Every structure is written in C-alpha cells, then in structure tokens.
Ligand binder design. Structure first.
Ligand SMILES: CCCCCCCC/C=C\CCCCCCCC(=O)O[C@H](COC(=O)CCCCCCCCCCCCCCC)COP(=O)(O)OC[C@H](O)CO
Ligand SMILES: Cc1ccc(-c2ncccn2)c(C(=O)N2C[C@H](COc3ccc(F)cn3)CC[C@H]2C)c1
Ligand SMILES: CCCCCCCCS[C@@H]1O[C@H](CO)[C@@H](O)[C@H](O)[C@H]1O
Ligand SMILES: CCCCCCCCS[C@@H]1O[C@H](CO)[C@@H](O)[C@H](O)[C@H]1O
Ligand SMILES: CCCCCCCCS[C@@H]1O[C@H](CO)[C@@H](O)[C@H](O)[C@H]1O
Ligand SMILES: CCCCCCCCS[C@@H]1O[C@H](CO)[C@@H](O)[C@H](O)[C@H]1O
Ligand SMILES: [Cl-]
Length: 305
C-alpha cells in the first residue's frame, strides 16, 4: 500500500534527482558560456565600430570583457567538469594554468572597475587634478594586466595535481596551517572587500554630485553612465560574494572538513562557481538595457547575423 511510496522515494534519490541535477547544471553552464562569449564579443565590436563610443569608460569596459572572455573560454569548461566529477582530468600543467588564469581574470576585472570609479570620481567630484585620455587609459589597461599577471603567481605555485589511490585531484599544497589563512585573507580583501568598499564610497559621492545648457547636457549624459556603472559594480559584488565567503570559511576558518554534508558543500560551491561565470553574461546584458549606444550596436548585430 505504502510500499510504492518508498519505491518512488528511492527512485527520486537514486535517479530522478541526480539526473535532474546534472541537467540543470550543464544547461546553466552552457547558457552562460554561449551568452558570455557572444555578448562580450559584441562589446569589443561595438566599441571598435562606433568611434563615438571610444570613451575612457568604454575602453575599460572592453578590458573587462577581455577578462570575462578569458575566464569563460578557458576556466568555465574546466569548472564544469570539476563540479560534475569532483576530480581533475586535465593533467598536472593545466592544474596550475587554469586556477592561475581564473585568479588573473578576477584581479583584472576588479582592478578595471576600480580605475573606472577612480576616473569618474576625479572627473565629476574633483575636476582638473588629473587628465584622463583614451591614450592613457590604454596604458592603465596594460598596467592592470601586468599587475594581475604578477600577483597571481603564488596561486599557481601552490597548485598540485595529486593522484588518489585511479583519479587525480587539483588542490592547493600548503606547508603549514598559517600560510593559507594569511594568503586567503589577503586574497579576499585585495580582490573583493577593499576595492568594492572604496568603489561604493566613490559612487555614493558621485551620486551626490550628479543628483548652462552645455553643463546640463553634460550632467544628463554622466547620469546615464553612473546609473549603468553602479549596477555593474552592484551585480559584480553580488555575483562574487558567495564564492568569496565560501573560500574564507573554508581556507581561513577551517570549515567544510566533515564528509557528512559532502553533497550540500559541493552544491554550494558549484552554484557559487556558476555565479562568477554568470557575471560575464550579465555585463553585456546590463549594457543593453542601461546604455542606448550599446543597445543600438547590439540590435545591429542581431539584424546582420
Ligand atoms: C586593493 C586595491 C586598492 C586600490 C584600488 C583603488 C580603488 C579606488 C576606487 C574608488 C575611488 C574612491 C575615492 C574615495 C571615496 C571616499 C568617499 C568617502 O569619504 O566616503 C564618506 C564616508 O566615509 C566614511 O565615513 C568612512 C567609511 C569607512 C568604512 C570602512 C569599512 C568598509 C571598508 C571599505 C574598504 C576600505 C579600504 C581601506 C583603504 C586603505 C562619505 O562621503 P560624504 O560625502 O558623506 O563625506 C564624508 C562624510 O563627512 C562622512 O559622514
Ligand atoms: C571554479 C571557480 C570559479 C571561481 C572562483 C573564484 N574564487 C574567488 C574569487 C573569484 N572567483 C574559484 C576559486 O575558488 N578560486 C579561484 C582559483 C581557482 O579557479 C579555478 C577555476 C576553474 C577550475 F577548474 C579550477 N580552479 C584559485 C582558488 C580560488 C580563490 C573557482
Ligand atoms: C525551486 C524548485 C524546486 C527545488 C526542489 C529541490 C529538491 C531537492 S530534494 C534532494 O533529494 C536528494 C535525494 O538524494 C537529497 O540528497 C538532497 O539533499 C535533496 O536536496
Ligand atoms: C552533476 C552530476 C550529478 C550529481 C548528483 C549528486 C547527487 C546525488 S543524490 C543521491 O545521493 C545518495 C547519497 O545518500 C546516493 O545514495 C544516491 O545514489 C544519489 O543518487
Ligand atoms: C613547501 S612549498 C611552499 O613553501 C612556502 C614557504 O615559503 C609555504 O608558505 C607554502 O605553504 C608552500 O606551499
Ligand atoms: C592577514 C589576516 C590573517 C587572518 C587569519 C589568521 C588567524 C586565524 S582566524 C581563526 O581561524 C580559526 C581556524 O581554526 C578559527 O577556528 C577561528 O574562529 C578564527 O578566528
Ligand atoms: Cl579537483
């Protein structure tokens, strides 16, 4: 009578749920992969074609798309396999490269948003101290890459591919308990908390300032960009909060060592990994709704191809 209820429960646990879980996982990763690649390519195209769009902000936004593409093309497919098998199938060398490239992508992105807020802050709040030209934005972009490429070397250095006795795992090799705590504390503050906290205070001051016929035309244009950039910074802080918190709890507070909640821990990190990659898909979509100049070029792309 009730025996069929027990069968359908084990049918759900053994087959239906895991098959319904792998489908949503792969569809979410694939949908983000496609949208992030097309959108971020359109961003680079829209600025390359439209010469009026070659502002200092948009030159930095193109750099953000390069960091997003780097993570989507290389890191996203690797993260998808790890989140399914929970093992490393790409060998010893890629165990250092891919984790390194992901850290490099995060540094470039947050440093790019920082220089954008810094450029807007001096342009609106404190004029005539520092001149910002597209020629000098290209030099800042190169410095952003040089710094990110350098400071993420220790991340690559600690990666180790160790066999488990038939399958390999890629994880960090730490000689002592204190080093990972100090490193991952600095990682969280340097790549997340400090820049976003400064950015929030910068945009709050920019909001106070923004909210002669030429000066009114200037403000209304600057208002359209501030409204967009504040959303980008807000979506960025949200997309990156879960993984940043999970890494601090794991690496600094020694959590998630018990194997009883294993699947729930995998589910939490998996969704947080996807949220990072979803950010790359969000940015072009944000530019479409909050920027009419990007919207125009995006509509021109769908009409042509
Ligand atoms: C690693 C990479 C770093 C380098 C990357 C560079 C990134 C650069 C980005 C943006 C430029 C920001 C420019 C600076 C903007 C600063 C804006 C600012 O002063 O904020 C005020 C609030 O602060 C205050 O009370 C103080 C608030 C303190 C909050 C502390 C907790 C959050 C931490 C947040 C991060 C700390 C970082 C530390 C930097 C060394 C509000 O203004 P308001 O008009 O009301 O006048 C003040 C009023 O009189 C206070 O009532
Ligand atoms: C899957 C993924 C996605 C995003 C992040 C991330 N974390 C913090 C801020 C932003 N994003 C992480 C991550 O947890 N980290 C980044 C890095 C490893 O990245 C990868 C990426 C793909 C792969 F197959 C193996 N490792 C070094 C360790 C650690 C800090 C992992
Ligand atoms: C918003 C749409 C509805 C979401 C519903 C999610 C149901 C998940 S049931 C799932 O059953 C497994 C059986 O093996 C257990 O292991 C898991 O702990 C448990 O989470
Ligand atoms: C992304 C690829 C799919 C991942 C699915 C993970 C969820 C497993 S649910 C369930 O967990 C039980 C634990 O008690 C086992 O007994 C069952 O055999 C298993 O079905
Ligand atoms: C041993 S290799 C490397 O040596 C460092 C010493 O400088 C430690 O801090 C790291 O944890 C460890 O991975
Ligand atoms: C650069 C800053 C470095 C900060 C990290 C080093 C200090 C350890 S924090 C400490 O970690 C323990 C791990 O077991 C937890 O049990 C505690 O609750 C928590 O307070
Ligand atoms: Cl792994």
């Amino acid at each position: 009578a009730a025996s069929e209820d027990e069968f359908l429960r084990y049918l759900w646990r053994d087959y239906l749920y895991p098959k319904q879980y792998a489908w949503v996982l792969i569809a979410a990763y694939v949908a983000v992969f496609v949208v992030a690649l097309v959108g971020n390519t359109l961003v680079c195209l829209a600025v390359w074609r439209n010469h009026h769009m070659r502002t200092v902000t948009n030159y930095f936004l193109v750099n953000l798309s390069l960091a997003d593409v780097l993570a989507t093309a290389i890191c996203l497919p690797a993260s998808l396999l790890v989140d399914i098998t929970e093992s490393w199938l790409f060998g010893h060398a890629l165990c250092k490269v891919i984790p390194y490239l992901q850290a490099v992508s995060v540094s470039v992105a947050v440093l790019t948003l920082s220089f954008i807020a810094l450029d807007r802050w001096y342009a609106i709040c404190h004029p005539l101290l520092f001149k910002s030209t597209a020629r000098r934005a290209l030099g800042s972009i190169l410095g952003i890459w040089a710094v990110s490429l350098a400071i993420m070397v220790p991340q690559a250095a600690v990666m180790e591919c160790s066999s488990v006795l038939a399958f390999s795992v890629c994880d960090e090799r730490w000689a002592d308990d204190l080093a990972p705590k100090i490193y991952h504390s600095c990682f969280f503050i340097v790549t997340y908390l400090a820049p976003l906290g400064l950015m929030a205070m910068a945009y709050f001051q920019i909001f106070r300032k923004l909210w002669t016929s030429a000066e009114v035309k200037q403000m209304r244009a600057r208002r359209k960009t501030a409204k967009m950039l504040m959303v980008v910074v807000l979506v960025f802080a949200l997309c990156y909060l879960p993984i940043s918190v999970l890494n601090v709890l794991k690496r600094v507070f020694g959590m998630f060592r018990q194997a009883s909640d294993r699947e729930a821990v995998y589910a939490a990190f998996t969704f947080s990994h996807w949220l990072v990659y979803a950010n790359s898909a969000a940015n072009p979509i944000i530019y479409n709704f909050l920027s009419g100049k990007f919207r125009e070029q995006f509509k021109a792309a769908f009409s042509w191809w």
